[PDB]
Amino acid sequence: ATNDEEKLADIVENEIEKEIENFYYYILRDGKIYPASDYDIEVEKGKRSANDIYAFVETDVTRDFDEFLFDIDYGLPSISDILKFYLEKAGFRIANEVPTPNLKYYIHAVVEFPQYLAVNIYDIDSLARALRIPQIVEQKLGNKPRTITADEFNDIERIVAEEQPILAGYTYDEALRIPYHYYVDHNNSFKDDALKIAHAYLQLFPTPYQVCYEWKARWFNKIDCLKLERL
Amino acid sequence: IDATNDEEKLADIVENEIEKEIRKIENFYYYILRDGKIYPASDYDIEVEKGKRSANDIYAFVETDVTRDFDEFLFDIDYGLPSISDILKFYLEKAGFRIANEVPTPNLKYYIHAVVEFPQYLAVNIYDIDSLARALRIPQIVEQKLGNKPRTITADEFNDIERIVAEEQPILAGYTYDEALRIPYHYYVDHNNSFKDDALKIAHAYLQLFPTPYQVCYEWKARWFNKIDCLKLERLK
């Protein structure tokens, strides 16, 4: 499992390196990487298959070191993406969505300006469980695979993002608002609550397979992530 | 009245600054002072912390978003509302409340959202903070939870109010505020057509109930911004 994740991080890193503009990518089961937008056009043309998508890559670019560290350590994935990814992997189909049923990984790549790259690899199922998605989908839709309406997607989305406490008694939307307030907006009044959320997040949410690199002489050079966090 | 004159002045202040920045993507947040001077917010906060500048002089807060996708640019123009956190903070402080040990901005009248499309276009959206807070039912929720007498509130009290405003009350076509942000994003930015009916319902309620921002648009043409009709803008690729 860790072997596949190391391979995926080098696939992401080589692509960012090659590029050094683009933010979203798909990694296929064969290890090929493509920008997500152009792949979606090929999928609908019938040229490429959505069944071949193995990993989804979201690239954030930063110029502030506090933001870079926050993104890599405490940054939450989009709840809309994980819900969509979980539903499709469980056999459901969302109206107007081409499903990606064999998606295993969610990858968040953060580039600090170039100076550093941090590649975070998450298992989608593990992430969906921590977001308390399976139980809500089961209570609301059942187990029988079907196409769900936009209204049904929205009803589930509301519960998971706004109604269910996930971290230190807070909902997903409060857990986006409160930490960022302290960590990125540098507002000290939200220290107590941000730290409570941070502490719960680190234990309850799946630890990502994290690979770090430093930009030196036209290359990204693999380094210990602790060195990045310690600088 | 003179509100429209002030808003036109504010949009040219923002435009002049984005233009100045392009000719030399550096700063995303700014303050506009009551004298019309514009400063990056991060630097200004340090000058306040030093006793050089006063948070009392802040008249408008500017948030600049930069985009490279036309659909996202149009969505940000049409639905680029200020952060709930910001409007609540701005309303509380303007009403005399103090949030824990944080430095208040009591004389803030406007929230400005500037969107730059890559450079090709600039759209400046000016929101009146009071009008926005009222449409969000912020005064009624603050009154029910804190009372009418201003005092210092805890971070927990701020959070409790924020949760009701954004995640509990049906504010637009029966949806909570957070659903009202997500549904049109799903329709316009995620390009999912099944979300059309709900997005249009929210759009209709939003255009009726919420205050219309004063919107000013510009096209980048030969090292300068040049005025353009905003509705002409939505036709451009």
Author numbering:
A (entry chain B): 24 to 43, 55 to 147, 152 to 269
B (entry chain A): 22 to 45, 54 to 147, 152 to 270
Paper text:
Acidianus two-tailed virus (ATV) infects crenarchaea of the genus Acidianus living in terrestrial thermal springs at extremely high temperatures and low pH. ATV is a member of the Bicaudaviridae virus family and undergoes extra-cellular development of two tails, a process that is unique in the viral world. ATV is the fourth most abundant of these proteins. Remarkably, ATV displays a new protein fold, consistent with the absence of homologues of this protein in public sequence databases.
The crystals of the second form reached a 2.15 Å diffraction limit and comprised two monomers in its asymmetric unit. The current model is refined against native data to 2.15 Å, resulting in an R/R factors of 20.2%/23.4% and includes residues 22 to 270 in monomer A and 25 to 269 in monomer B. Two loops could not be built in the model owing to the lack of supporting electron density. The first of these loops comprises residues Ser46 to Thr53 in monomer A and Arg44 to Ile54 in monomer B, whereas the second missing loop encompases residues Gly148 to Arg151 in both monomers. The structure of an ATV monomer is made up of 10 helices and two -sheets, one composed of seven strands and the other consisting of two short parallel strands. As expected for a hyperthermostable protein, the ATV monomer is stabilised by a relatively high number of salt bridges (5 in monomer A and 8 in monomer B; to be considered as engaged in a salt bridge, the centroids of the side-chain charged groups and at least a pair of side-chain nitrogen and oxygen atoms of the ion-pairing residues must be within a 4 Å distance). Some of these salt bridges form networks, namely the triplets Glu29/Asp33/Lys260 and Glu252/Lys254/Lys265 in monomer B, another feature related to hyperthermostability. Furthermore, a disulphide bond is observed between cysteines 250 and 263 in both monomers. The analysis of the crystal interfaces present in the second crystal form with the PISA software suggested two possible dimers with a significant buried area at the interface, namely 1258 Å2 and 1087 Å2 per monomer, respectively. In the closed dimer the concave sides of the monomers face each other thereby creating a chamber with a volume of 8650 Å3. Finally, the two interfaces identified in the second-form crystals of ATV are assembled head-to-tail, resulting in helicoidal fibers that extend indefinitely along the crystallographic c-axis.
